[PDB]
Amino acid sequence: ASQVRQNYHEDCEASINKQINMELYASYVYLSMAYYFERDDVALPGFAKFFKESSDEEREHAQTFMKYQNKRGGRIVLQQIAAPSMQEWGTGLEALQAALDLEKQVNQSLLELHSTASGNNDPHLTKLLEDEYLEEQVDSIKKIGDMITKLKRAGPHGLGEYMFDKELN
Amino acid sequence: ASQVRQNYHEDCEASINKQINMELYASYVYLSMAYYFERDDVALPGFAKFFKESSDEEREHAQTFMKYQNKRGGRIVLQQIAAPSMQEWGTGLEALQAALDLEKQVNQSLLELHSTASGNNDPHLTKLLEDEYLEEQVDSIKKIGDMITKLKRAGPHGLGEYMFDKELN
Amino acid sequence: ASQVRQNYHEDCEASINKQINMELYASYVYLSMAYYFERDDVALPGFAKFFKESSDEEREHAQTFMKYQNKRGGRIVLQQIAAPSMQEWGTGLEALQAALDLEKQVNQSLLELHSTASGNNDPHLTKLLEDEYLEEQVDSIKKIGDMITKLKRAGPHGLGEYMFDKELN
Amino acid sequence: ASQVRQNYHEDCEASINKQINMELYASYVYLSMAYYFERDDVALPGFAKFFKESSDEEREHAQTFMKYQNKRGGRIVLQQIAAPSMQEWGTGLEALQAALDLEKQVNQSLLELHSTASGNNDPHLTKLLEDEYLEEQVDSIKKIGDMITKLKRAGPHGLGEYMFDKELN
């Protein structure tokens, strides 16, 4: 084993690898969305910007997990990153609905991983999950909820979609 | 011939002259639009500003071609600049539709001139077209497309036309 | 078709989509390398930094192509990103050898795409390839060659690998 | 009992006292090493500096635990600090091997103390351990692992030891 490894269970190691794949998947989904919103026939720069930032963030999370794996003396195993579920994401509202649903799946996975970490008595890993993942995830989910409500109020189509988009830019 | 002229075919020289006429025509059309949008009964200052800038840009392009003609040792032959197709341009949307058709005709003409230049093996002229004309043209066509989509979303009439006009100003 | 599309052949559109997949694949390979070199049992921070930068660069290239596709009025089709060929990359020297083969495959693909674009008479696309892709690719291949020679001189193992690693950091 | 004491079990109190002794022991070991490396017949200033800093850090940790004991209304009981295991630490590599092994014993003890804290439902103490001890310990262990690998690559004797030492200075 690694000269550094201590109190680091193989299931926690494997589950972090799955989490890295998942964060990269989400990055990729958001990148799809970001550029869908720069189509000449879509043209929503605020949504574009929002998803571009989200793509970058999810990539940073994957990287934090890669760094963590190495830190504990685990070994990073990288898998294929699936194509995003869609090529076209419909309205702004629909894209946010899909992001909300995605963010919650990621959150579910993070909580499962917390539970595995707790059952294996790994308080270094529960603390990482709490400080670096679970708080962010909760803020994100709140923010997207807020956005969805604001957009349904403003629009969610036509002028209201146009105006809401400006608040994101 | 000119003491400077080298590898500069007369068809490329004549085609540049046509192109100067065309850029000046486009300048003039945009000038018409610019001031149509400062009519008391129209009053769209953002559209006005956008077409005033476009009119200036197209005059600069014409001038760049005049300068190029002289660089190569060609001789500038200036023709009549036609009256614009219209005196009144309708809605903001309609004016943008007309700019889009105009920008595309200009693009087609630039590509024809590129093709004449490649067939006459003149890489100095193909490079000019790529660097100074074809790129700006493509960005400009993208930009107008985006604008048209944004305006159809926002308006394209009434409150939406009024708000969209503000993002241009 | 798109309101913006002009002189943009479907084969060039499809080939750009392949190219985006390829640049993202390369990004991913370099990400793998970057973090392989932060393993406690590897510990080559200069190599790590070099491949982390390369991973970022290749993601930016992919994004530039996504943006280009939209500029031209094409439609971005995102595919599965394959797992990297390896999980462990051996020595610094071996990793650079693999980057060199990778950079060259990418170059070959960019040249094929240039050739498709010239055969379809699309000088806007040949210009993009020359300005934004082919030049960086050639510099990058030169740079990696230089690095390989420098590392073979210095090391390529032991004290020499350690010192060479410092010039990258 | 102390006017402040709440939810603070006597076993957690006693175990913190043992932890204070241990941190001071480690400080002392590192101080030994720090000055072994300023012997005229050793002369490794980077290793000297590294261990001097580590000595200071471990003393600060002991002090943080002293402050914590008082904070919860426990009573600090200070014991003799054992002589370090050795008077001479051999090569730089050997000293780092011994530090790695020491850091892991401290880490084991910290995790035992976390477990005692969890079993006594003391989330104030689990949180202290997570934020102020366990993260530091893990970073430290990673860093020393990295160092060991870098030194085995560079040297671990002769010129390579000399050069590696300069990276620590």
List, as one string, the DSSP characters of C8-75. --HHHHHHHHHHHHHHHHHHHHHHHHHHHTTSTTT--HHHHHHHHHHHHHHHHHHHHHHHHHHHHT--
Residues 6 or more apart in contact with residue B13 via CB below 8 angstroms: B69, B72, B74, B75
Residues 6 or more apart in contact with residue D163 via CB below 8 angstroms: C159, C162, C163, D154, D155
Is-cis flag, bond preceding D84, omega within 30? Answer: no
Q: Give dist(CA C34, CA C50) in Å, integer.
A: 7
Q: Does C73 touch chain B (CB under 8 A)?
A: yes
Q: Give dist(CA B99, CA B141) in Å, integer.
A: 9
C121–B115 CB contact, under 8 Å: yes
Q: Give dist(CA D107, CA D102) in Å, integer.
A: 9
Question: Could you write out the three-class secondary structure of A68-112?
Answer: HHHHHCCCCCCCCECCCCCCCCCCHHHHHHHHHHHHHHHHHHHHH
Tracing tokens 């970058």 back to the chain, one arrives at A56
Q: Give dist(CA B157, CA B138) in Å, integer.
A: 27
Q: Give dist(CA D19, CA D66) in Å, integer.
A: 10
Q: Are D103 and D30 in contact (CB under 8 A)?
A: no
Is-cis flag, bond preceding C123, omega within 30? Answer: no
Contacts 24+ apart (CB under 8 A), A96-101: A96/A144, A96/A147, A96/A148, A96/A151, A97/A148, A98/A29, A98/A33, A99/A30, A99/A33, A99/A51, A99/A54, A99/A144, A100/A141, A100/A144, A100/A145, A100/A148
Q: Do chains A and D touch (3 or more CB pairs under 8 A)?
A: yes
Largest CA distance in chain A: 61
Q: Does A80 touch chain B (CB under 8 A)?
A: no
Angle ∠(A116,C83,C114) on CA atoms, nearest 5: 150
Q: Give dist(CA C24, CA C56) in Å, integer.
A: 10
Neighbour tally for C17: CB within 10 Å: 18
Tracing tokens 């003149």 back to the chain, one arrives at B122
Q: Give dist(CA B145, CA B100) in Å, integer.
A: 7
Q: Detail the DSSP E strand segments found in chain B.
A: none
Neighbour tally for D112: CB within 10 Å: 13
Domain that holds residue B137: 10-168
Q: Which of D12, D3, D18, D11 is nearest to D105 (CA)?
A: D18
Say how many Å lie between the first and final Cα of chain A, rounded. 49
C123–B138 CB contact, under 8 Å: no
Q: Give dist(CA D90, CA D103) in Å, integer.
A: 18
Q: Give dist(CA C82, CA C22) in Å, integer.
A: 9
Residue A148 exposed, middle or buried by CB count within 10 Å (0-12, 13-18, 19+):
middle
Residue B22, CA distances (Å) to B18, C21, C133 in order: 6, 41, 33
Tokens representing C166 are 């410092």
CA gyration radius, chain D? 18
Residue C15, CA distances (Å) to A115, C67, C74, C134, D119 in order: 45, 15, 11, 16, 61
Nearest residue in A to D111, CA atom: A123
Q: Does C32 touch chain A (CB under 8 A)?
A: yes
Q: Give dist(CA A53, CA A26) in Å, integer.
A: 12
Could you give the dihedral angle defined by the CA atoms of residues D5, D9, D11 and D13, in that order, rounded to the nearest 10 degrees? -20
SS3 D151: helix
Tracing tokens 């305006």 back to the chain, one arrives at B151
- Residue D20: CA atoms inside 13 Å, Cβ hemisphere, count? 21
The residue count of chain C comes to 169
A123–D114 CB contact, under 8 Å: yes
Is-cis flag, bond preceding D45, omega within 30? Answer: no
Q: Which of B42, B55, B61, B79 is nearest to B136 (CA)?
A: B61
Q: Give dist(CA A117, CA D114) in Å, integer.
A: 14
Q: Which of D111, D122, D124 to mutate to test the interface with A (most CBs of A within 10 A)?
A: D111
Angle ∠(B50,B53,B57) on CA atoms, nearest 5: 135
Sort out which chain B residues have CB atoms less than 8 A from A42's CB and list them: 149
Q: Give dist(CA B88, CA A161) in Å, integer.
A: 31
Tell me, yes or no, whether B139 lies in a domain: yes
C42–D150 CB contact, under 8 Å: no
Q: Are B92 and B161 in contact (CB under 8 A)?
A: yes
Ordered DSSP codes for D18-64: HHHHHHHHHHHHHHHHHHHTTSTTT--HHHHHHHHHHHHHHHHHHHH
Sort out which chain C residues have CB atoms less than 8 A from D150's CB and list them: 43, 162
Residue D78, CA distances (Å) to A75, A148, C47, C71, D63 in order: 42, 59, 47, 73, 12
SS3 B133: helix
Tokens representing C151 are 């590392």
Q: Give dist(CA A110, CA A63) in Å, integer.
A: 15
Q: Which of C33, C1, C68, C50 is nearest to C164 (CA)?
A: C50
Q: Which of B35, B64, B66, B70 is nearest to B51 (CA)?
A: B35
Nearest residue in C to D159, CA atom: C159
Q: How far is D149 from chain C (nearest CA, A)?
A: 6
Residues 6 or more apart in contact with residue A54 via CB below 8 angstroms: A30, A34, A99
A6–D115 CB contact, under 8 Å: no
Residue B54, CA distances (Å) to B34, B99, B144, B163, D91 in order: 9, 10, 11, 21, 74
Q: Give dist(CA D150, CA C45) in Å, integer.
A: 10
Q: Give dist(CA A97, CA A102) in Å, integer.
A: 9
Q: Give dist(CA C74, CA C66) in Å, integer.
A: 9
Q: Which of D91, D92, D85, D86 is nearest to D147 (CA)?
A: D92
SS3 D92: helix
Among B114, B131, B142, beta carbon nearest to C4: B142
Residue B90, CA distances (Å) to A118, B97, C140 in order: 68, 11, 53
Rounded to the nearest angstrom, the gap between the alpha carbon of residue D63 and the centroid of all alpha carbons in its chain is 12
**Which residues 147-166 of chain C have a CB within 8 Å of chain D?**
158-159, 161-163, 166
Among C38, C73, C84, beta carbon nearest to A67: C38
Among D107, D108, D148, beta carbon nearest to A3: D148
Tell me, yes or no, whether A132 lies in a domain: yes
Tokens representing B43 are 């009053």
Tell me, yes or no, whether D3 lies in a domain: no
Q: Give dist(CA D89, CA C99) in Å, integer.
A: 42
Q: Give dist(CA A62, CA A97) in Å, integer.
A: 23
Q: Does C6 touch chain B (CB under 8 A)?
A: yes
Q: Do chains C and A touch (3 or more CB pairs under 8 A)?
A: yes
Residues 6 or more apart in contact with residue D2 via CB below 8 angstroms: D73, D74
Residues 6 or more apart in contact with residue C56 via CB below 8 angstroms: C27
Neighbour tally for C1: CB within 10 Å: 10
Q: Does C119 touch chain B (CB under 8 A)?
A: no
Residues 6 or more apart in contact with residue C121 via CB below 8 angstroms: B115, C7
Sort out which chain D residues have CB atoms less than 8 A from A72's CB and list them: 138
C40–D149 CB contact, under 8 Å: yes
Neighbour tally for C165: CB within 10 Å: 25
Residue D11 exposed, middle or buried by CB count within 10 Å (0-12, 13-18, 19+):
middle
Q: Which of D28, D44, D47, D31 is nearest to D148 (CA)?
A: D47
State this model's resolution in angstroms: 2.4
What technique determined this structure? X-ray
Tell me, yes or no, whether D82 lies in a domain: yes
Residue B93, φ and ψ in degrees, nearest 5: -60, -45
Tell me, yes or no, whether C41 lies in a domain: yes
Q: Give dist(CA D158, CA D163) in Å, integer.
A: 9
Residue A81, beta-bridge partner list: C81
DSSP label at residue A131? I
Residue C81, beta-bridge partner list: A81
C162–D146 CB contact, under 8 Å: no
Q: Give dist(CA B59, CA B53) in Å, integer.
A: 10
Tokens representing A59 are 């990539």
Neighbour tally for D124: CB within 10 Å: 15
Give chains near D: 3+ CB pairs under 8 A. Answer: A, C
Q: Does A121 touch chain D (CB under 8 A)?
A: yes
Q: Which of C31, C27, C98 is nearest to C63 (CA)?
A: C27
Residue C50, CA distances (Å) to B112, C39, C145, D93 in order: 45, 15, 14, 28
H or E segment at D117?
A: helix D92-119
Residue A100 exposed, middle or buried by CB count within 10 Å (0-12, 13-18, 19+):
middle
Tell me, yes or no, whether C124 lies in a domain: yes
SS3 D79: coil
Tell me, yes or no, whether D2 lies in a domain: no
Tokens representing A34 are 């970001």
C78–A82 CB contact, under 8 Å: no
Tell me, yes or no, whether C103 lies in a domain: yes
Q: Dihedral of CA B169/C2/C8/C11: which sign?
A: positive
Q: Give dist(CA D15, CA D31) in Å, integer.
A: 24
Q: Are D80 and D49 in contact (CB under 8 A)?
A: no
State the total domains in chain A.
1
Q: Which of B141, B150, B151 to mutate to test the interface with C (most CBs of C within 10 A)?
A: B141
SS3 C81: strand
Could you give the dihedral angle defined by the CA atoms of residues B166, B168, C2 and C3, in that order, rounded to the nearest 10 degrees? 100
Residue B161, CA distances (Å) to A90, B94, B151, B165 in order: 23, 12, 7, 6
Q: How far is B120 from chain A (nearest CA, A)?
A: 35
**CATH number, residue D139:** 1.20.1260.10
